[model samples]
Target: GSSPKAVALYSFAGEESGDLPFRKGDVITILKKSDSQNDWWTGRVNGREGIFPANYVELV
Candidate 1:
């Protein structure tokens, strides 16, 4: 039961693209322990690096 899971980065605060730099409903891998108050996550989406809110994503 330790298989990888998918999660969504819901933006309940700002514009989806302006705040997340990605389209709405975009599914991205939840990089483990990739969160910090002053750091950014180097998540992959469509072969591009999307640095989004480290504390805004949730498990689904």
Candidate 2:
């Protein structure tokens, strides 16, 4: 299957959770959901690794 795409709706500076950082308006590849309950998920952007809140992204 093709990688699902996501668009960041909010900027997660990654100043707290220590998750990899990305910016608002950034597009990420939805590699997979890191959790089954919470919105946190694994993703990649610009060929870099990171985990971002699902609530911060919209499936595109």
Candidate 3:
């Protein structure tokens, strides 16, 4: 396992307010975590904060 800091493994363009949109290779600063690895995880990308799929990123 890795720390709260992570790298986006895939590009994600979310349309919801609670969703975090990011491009592949982007660094994500994790804030909140999901109960399961398959759920959405909260993080911030260049100061933009929202939730993104856990599988979309790899904890660094």
lDDT of 2: 0.74
> Any idea what lDDT model 1 has?
0.47
The sequence of per-residue lDDT tens digits that candidate 3 reaches over residues 1-60 is 458798999999998887889999999999998667799888999668999899998889
Which lDDT tens digits does candidate 2 get at residues 1-60?
333887888887675543757788999888777444256888888657767778887777
**What are the C-alpha RMSDs, in order, of all predicted structures?**
5.3, 3.1, 1.6
Poorest 10 consecutive residues of model 1 by lDDT? 1-10
Clashes of each: 0, 0, 0
Which residue pairs clash within candidate 3? none
For residues 1-60, what per-residue lDDT tens digits would candidate 1 score against the true structure? 321323445543334553335455666564443435344454555444446665555434
Top-scoring candidate (TM-score): 3
> Which of the numbered candidates is closest to the native, going by highest lDDT?
3
* TM-score against truth, every candidate: 0.42, 0.72, 0.86
